[PDB]
Amino acid sequence: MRIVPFGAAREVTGSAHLLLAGGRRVLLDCGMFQGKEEARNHAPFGFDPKEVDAVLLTHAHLDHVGRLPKLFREGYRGPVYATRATVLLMEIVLEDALKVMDEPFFGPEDVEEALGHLRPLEYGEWLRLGALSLAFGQAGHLPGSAFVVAQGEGRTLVYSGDLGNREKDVLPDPSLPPLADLVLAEGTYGDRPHRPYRETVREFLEILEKTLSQGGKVLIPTFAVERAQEILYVLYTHGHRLPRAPIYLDSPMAGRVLSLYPRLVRYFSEEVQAHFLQGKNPFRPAGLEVVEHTEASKALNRAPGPMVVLAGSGMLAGGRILHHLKHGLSDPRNALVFVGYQPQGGLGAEIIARPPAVRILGEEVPLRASVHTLGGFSGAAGQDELLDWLQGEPRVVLVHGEEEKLLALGKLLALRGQEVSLARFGEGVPV
RNA sequence: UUUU
Ligand SMILES: [Zn+2]
Ligand SMILES: [Zn+2]
């Protein structure tokens, strides 16, 4: 029993780790690389897809699934286990990836084939391959997200997948992992903890009452998946004290995902589940409008406030969000609220530097609108949660993170008495 | 971590 990291090593994208045991070859996630590594999506897996016994998906995010369709494009035909939640989201995630890709390293035929081999595997459901026993654990990062517990050959391995930020309210608490011989964990925020949740919300509401009352615009760049609808959850449970204004979720993808949420209620927190029991959908606050096409989206740049806008991409790497910022970032009455991580080097970081006037889509636009960064809205376990989850495990191999962050976490792990390393590309570790 |  060994685990060979095949992505997300000293990096965050490309998450894919081949589990070798019981004579079987199980594949944990099969995500795509993003941004700078993008090209490497064309390069070879590093293993023979045809020799894989069965693959497990921790969640539907593209960086853990974006490459699956490639796997099949190259021969794989085995089973792909996930939660119904991951399965349903996944369809949306991929279909979009197709349209977004410049260099489509796969096609509709591959996606269709991939989705075809998806077989449901819910929490506490034990799968058996060879002498190997597998099971999903509650990770709380996305609806239906999980961490893997691989047990066999008298050894125990845990692959954390992505862990959630337990402070928030939509998803359930991530679960503590079982005591294992080896833990292959993520460390996206291995360097720092997050701003508390309570105070980021309070601050959020504050920015809202002030911007809306003066009749301005609240521009919220967002990811179409958990993030978009989670912001809506706040608007829904605080709408009573919030000033009346249309809430434009100007992102079709976010819609499709939102439309899908009432079918996944069991995948949320007890709180979210209680609301649904009362016959209500807490992901649709009053005044919500899902903007489907360009014309209406453009119209919003010219229309006056007060209004709240949600658009992607959550990293300003394009999307309608640009066109919004291009036109409302120059008015001081408008507010810009970042509710997710902005990659360094990107426009987000730039705008946050707060220069006199950023450039957006071939034109310099003055920057008067206020800017705010609510890192407390992060969907990832901050360093303090990472330490608590990992607490107790003897051995730990860190994947998913920038070497610096991973290192930072390791120092703490080491000083704590935990044998730890930084997974290297294609270099299986002894379970 | 994808966005007409
Ligand atoms: Zn994720
Ligand atoms: Zn991830």
Side-chain angles (χ1 to χ4, degrees), chain A residues 21-334:
Chain A
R24 325 294 177 168
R25 290 196 192 300
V26 183
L27 213 233
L28 282 46
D29 290 328
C30 195
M32 69 167 73
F33 292 103
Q34 328 209 202
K36 305 189 302 183
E37 316 302 68
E38 248 211 356
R40 306 171 57 201
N41 264 170
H42 292 300
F45 279 117
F47 53 106
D48 171 50
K50 301 175 183 175
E51 282 292 294
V52 174
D53 280 316
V55 26
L56 272 49
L57 268 52
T58 54
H59 62 276
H61 273 146
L62 206 66
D63 73 296
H64 288 245
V65 164
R67 277 197 298 172
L68 189 65
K70 182 167 181 287
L71 203 74
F72 285 80
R73 184 191 184 69
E74 318 207 316
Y76 186 87
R77 248 58 175 168
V80 186
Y81 289 73
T83 57
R84 217 204 185 312
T86 307
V87 181
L88 295 171
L89 283 174
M90 180 151 52
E91 183 164 345
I92 297 175
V93 184
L94 272 30
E95 301 300 316
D96 174 275
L98 258 184
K99 289 193 171 182
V100 190
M101 240 163 273
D102 54 296
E103 280 291 295
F105 66 82
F106 74 72
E109 60 269 8
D110 303 304
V111 176
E112 178 189 293
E113 202 64 49
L115 291 173
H117 297 73
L118 296 173
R119 283 217 261 158
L121 178 61
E122 304 299 310
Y123 309 88
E125 227 139 74
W126 288 99
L127 173 71
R128 295 213 206 176
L129 312 198
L132 177 55
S133 303
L134 289 169
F136 276 163
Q138 185 49 262
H141 168 68
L142 274 200
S145 75
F147 65 70
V148 190
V149 174
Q151 189 291 301
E153 302 191 9
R155 301 260 86 189
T156 307
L157 161 93
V158 170
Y159 163 31
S160 81
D162 279 355
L163 261 26
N165 171 179
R166 61 183 301 284
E167 270 187 71
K168 296 156 61 150
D169 301 329
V170 175
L171 281 2
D173 290 316
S175 173
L176 278 179
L179 197 58
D181 302 303
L182 180 69
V183 183
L184 179 66
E186 61 113 0
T188 326
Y189 284 77
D191 62 336
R192 55 167 157 145
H194 294 303
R195 226 89 158 187
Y197 192 45
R198 300 298 205 57
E199 85 167 59
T200 287
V201 191
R202 285 190 227 108
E203 182 173 354
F204 186 59
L205 298 184
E206 292 168 9
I207 300 165
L208 280 173
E209 300 184 304
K210 166 155 175 49
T211 302
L212 299 179
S213 292
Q214 65 184 45
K217 294 182 188 187
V218 173
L219 282 29
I220 312 184
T222 50
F223 287 135
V225 188
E226 230 301 79
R227 204 53 46 65
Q229 16 288 290
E230 190 192 295
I231 292 303
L232 293 184
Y233 185 74
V234 173
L235 297 187
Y236 175 103
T237 71
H238 294 281
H240 68 83
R241 54 115 83 189
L242 281 175
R244 287 256 214 170
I247 295 182
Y248 308 100
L249 177 52
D250 185 21
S251 157
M253 206 182 127
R256 285 182 276 277
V257 182
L258 176 65
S259 302
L260 171 57
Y261 275 19
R263 296 160 48 171
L264 279 28
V265 41
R266 70 182 180 190
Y267 286 113
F268 298 103
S269 69
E270 294 295 338
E271 171 182 296
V272 170
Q273 296 201 72
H275 286 182
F276 277 110
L277 188 61
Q278 313 316 300
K280 317 160 176 179
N281 180 344
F283 293 118
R284 324 205 93 188
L288 161 60
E289 196 65 28
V290 163
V291 188
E292 304 300 353
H293 307 63
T294 321
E295 283 297 352
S297 192
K298 294 285 194 177
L300 289 183
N301 323 313
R302 301 165 283 158
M307 68 172 103
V308 176
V309 179
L310 295 180
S313 46
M315 301 195 321
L316 311 181
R320 293 177 183 184
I321 184 72
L322 287 170
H323 295 276
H324 288 320
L325 275 63
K326 181 208 178 198
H327 297 282
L329 226 46
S330 63
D331 173 338
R333 264 183 303 168
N334 300 338

Side-chain angles (χ1 to χ4, degrees), chain A residues 187-195 340-344 373-376 378 380-387 402 404-406 408-409 412:
Chain A
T188 326
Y189 284 77
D191 62 336
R192 55 167 157 145
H194 294 303
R195 226 89 158 187
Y341 174 95
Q342 300 305 305
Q344 59 132 303
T373 310
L374 301 181
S378 176
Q383 172 198 297
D384 60 311
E385 286 169 275
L386 258 19
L387 289 171
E402 320 188 305
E404 309 71 351
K405 322 274 191 166
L406 278 359
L409 209 198
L412 295 167

